[PDB]
Design a protein around this ligand. Structure first.
Ligand code: NAG
Ligand code: NAG
Lengths: 414, 226, 25, 50, 47
């Protein structure tokens, strides 16, 4: 058996000094089965490849153990050196159609049965027969979400300054005209104290002044009403940045340097993209950025190197569940199941299909899904910086008025 | 939403109260014990008149301005904050223990089908309880659900989704997605030894790869309550 | 925004008229 | 807050959002719509795949 | 009367300075607060 290292399905960890792995337990205190794993020590090329014994465990190991219990099997697991599913490639003497990776290893006779996440495809089925899928999951889009904290901090004039200057000019002219009217018939600062008390409610304070007071009281509230209306509108209208709304996203239909997204290597998604009637620019946009593994791809996505990634929906959902910093958008498309890679002359077709269907109908699949894929689930500046600035300004004004009154009292009473 | 705003506003109120009481005590050259406490809340709440009162005027004016700005921000946040199942699977104890609740549970299914056989092969007690209440058609189940004669109905996922999509009033929906007890397809039933199986599966795989069924899915399988 | 100038200028004429009326009376 | 929410959220009754409207895809007695008589629109409706 | 006509409807003022009278001013202040809330809601809906 050859198995591909898949993080949500096949966990691979180094063995201990004795050559075995630890006996861990789940939340229910059950012994987790582990099988000795054989594979290369380093996946990257140009390295001292050593076939050290690993210890791979996960989702498919339970199904493999169930199959070995139902029918007599002596299975040994293996890891593909290149870490790829395997499709048709081109080499020297390009007039050759040969399969590489896991599919090529299976065709070469090295392996007889494959228990690994492999998407069923027409090209793969034209040469290797598959069995009934374990579960039906399509492919989706994975994009790292941002955390909106603040925008347009309101300290003294976040919107405009000419409006504030006009308001200041208006209050100054209304104050001086009120003083002139009072003098013609509040000579001291009592008039301006009353005006400021009317502007800002603090409980401090013939017919000529009545109309001025009435119009000033009416005019005072519209400014704050407009300010709070604008604040509410700007809080309601946020960034709402959406990366991908679906397969038919017009933004995805065009290549952009700002948003880079691609798959890892050749797979069923690659064949689906190849067999497109009018989606041609996708290959030119994606062939310039390729990786070697899904772990590296998701690490790059986390490190903001990439913006979106395409893979099986179940893998993305599990990654989002285990890491709340990532979210999955879009909808299911090109939905297809999994399969088992077996040679056409293998007499184990029915003997495996019946067991798979029995396990599916007896609730083993849902139990494994619950116990392996559903472990767990999931202003900074605007109201802080402006508050700090206001507090500093208030402290400065308090000190200034303190020294001002200290000098003024001495000057008045010398 | 008070898990974040209230925590910071508490220390903000504490520090502004400390500054206010300090400056009020400095205002000595009318009691700091009660007047400061009263003025701490007489101006932030516009629905009060507990203030009753050069340096002091500027401080109270700027504090009233700050309180008005904070109230406006709070109202804006409250306005912005206003933009936004019964059973879970067959493992719930309600299905297995209908007698534990005063209202008896009644379920319906079409006999001589596959769901009944699957239930019988897994839970004989559930099949025995199901045999008491049976329905002979989907229309009868819909009528019972509309009239309340039935509590829950169990059938194939595809037909239930189709009925929900074509249901009127959006009052009949399923419990989410992905909670299917046994995800299984339909396929095409053939004869044993027929060599057409290879061609049929190759054609189906080519069709699903090319996405030639999307128009059929969008036209035949569509309706209200998306 | 732009309408703020119109709004503030709308009441200025009324205020000036009231001031003239109370000055002449 | 409740008053603002109820004023923001109104009826917003939209009859037809386009040709692909799912409501138009089903016959309803509450909403009745049809052409006048045979015309090019009638031929277009006759020549429909689904 | 003229001063009280606008001293309470505008919460940013203190021009009131003042059994039958209490009930009337209380209910009128309640109506003014309700009208202000309705005006703010209408502004939010219009924005
Ligand atoms: C094969 O499996 C059967 C299961 O009943 C077991 O009795 C038998 O010993 C097995 N044979 C070998 C060679 O493992
Ligand atoms: C497959 O199952 C049948 C009956 O269950 C059995 O007779 C047959 O030996 C099995 N095949 C193998 C290879 O054991």
């Amino acid at each position: 058996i050859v198995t591909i290292h898949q993080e949500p399905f096949v966990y691979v960890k180094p063995t201990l000094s004795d050559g075995t792995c630890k006996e861990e337990f789940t939340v229910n205190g059950d012994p987790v089965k582990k099988v000795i794993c054989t594979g290369p020590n380093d996946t990257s090329p140009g390295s001292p490849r050593h076939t050290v014994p690993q210890c791979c465990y996960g989702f498919c190991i339970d199904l493999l153990i169930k199959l070995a219990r139902t029918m007599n099997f002596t299975y040994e697991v293996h890891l593909v050196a290149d870490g790829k599913f395997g499709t048709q490639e081109r080499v020297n003497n390009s007039n050759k159609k040969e399969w590489n990776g896991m599919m090529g290893e299976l065709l070469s006779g090295q392996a007889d049965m494959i228990v690994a996440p492999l998407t069923i495809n027409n090209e793969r089925a034209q040469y290797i027969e598959f069995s009934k899928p374990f579960k039906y999951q399509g492919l989706t889009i994975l994009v790292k979400k941002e955390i909106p904290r603040s925008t347009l901090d309101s300290f003294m004039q976040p919107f405009q300054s000419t409006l504030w200057l006009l308001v200041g000019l208006s209050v100054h002219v209304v104050a001086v005209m009120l003083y002139l009217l009072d003098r013609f018939s509040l000579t001291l600062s009592s008039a301006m104290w009353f005006s400021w008390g009317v502007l800002l409610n603090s409980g401090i304070g013939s017919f000529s002044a009545r109309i001025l007071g009435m119009v000033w009281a009416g005019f005072a509230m519209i400014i704050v009403a407009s300010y709070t209306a604008n604040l509410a509108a700007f809080l309601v209208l946020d960034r709402p940045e959406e990366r991908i709304t679906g397969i038919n996203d017009p933004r995805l239909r065009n290549p952009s340097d700002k948003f880079i997204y691609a798959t890892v290597k050749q797979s069923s998604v690659d064949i689906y993209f190849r067999r497109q009637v009018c989606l041609s620019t996708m290959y030119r946009h994606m062939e310039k950025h390729n990786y070697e593994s899904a772990a590296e791809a998701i690490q790059a996505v986390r490190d903001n190197k990439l913006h979106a990634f395409i893979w099986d929906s179940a893998v993305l959902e599990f990654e989002a569940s285990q890491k709340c910093d990532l979210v999955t958008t879009g909808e299911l498309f090109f939905r297809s199941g999994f399969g088992i890679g077996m040679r056409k002359d293998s007499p184990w077709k029915q003997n495996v299909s019946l067991s798979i269907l029995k396990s599916h109908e007896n609730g083993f699949m849902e139990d494994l899904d619950k116990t392996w894929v559903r472990y767990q689930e999931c202003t900074f500046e605007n109201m802080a910086g402006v508050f700090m600035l206001v507090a500093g300004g208030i402290v400065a004004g308090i000190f200034l008025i303190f020294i001002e009154i200290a000098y003024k009292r001495h000057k008045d009473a010398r | 939403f008070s898990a974040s705003v209230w925590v910071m506003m508490f220390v903000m109120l504490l520090i502004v109260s400390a500054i206010a009481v300090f400056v009020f005590e400095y205002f000595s050259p009318s009691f700091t014990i009660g007047k400061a406490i009263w003025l701490l809340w007489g101006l932030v709440f516009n629905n009060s008149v507990p203030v009753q009162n050069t340096t002091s005027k500027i401080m109270v004016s700027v504090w009233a301005f700050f309180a008005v700005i904070f109230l406006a921000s709070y109202t804006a946040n409250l306005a912005a904050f206003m933009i936004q199942d019964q059973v879970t699977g067959l493992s719930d104890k309600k299905f297995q223990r209908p007698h534990d609740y005063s209202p008896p549970f009644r379920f319906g299914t079409v006999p001589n089908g596959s769901t009944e056989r699957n239930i019988r092969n897994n839970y004989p007690y559930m099949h025995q309880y199901m045999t008491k209440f049976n329905q002979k058609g989907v229309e009868d189940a819909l009528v019972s659900l509309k009239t309340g004669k039935l509590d829950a109905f169990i059938y194939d996922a595809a037909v239930l989704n189709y009925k929900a999509g074509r249901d009127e009033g959006c009052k009949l929906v399923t419990i989410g997605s992905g909670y299917i007890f046994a995800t299984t397809g339909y396929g095409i039933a053939l004869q044993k030894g027929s060599p057409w199986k290879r061609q049929i599966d190759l054609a189906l795989l080519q069709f699903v790869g090319d996405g030639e069924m999307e128009e059929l899915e969008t036209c035949w399988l569509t309706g209200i309550c998306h | 925004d732009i309408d703020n100038m119109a709004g503030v200028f709308y009441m200025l004429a009324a205020a000036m008229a009231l001031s003239l009326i109370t000055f002449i009376w």
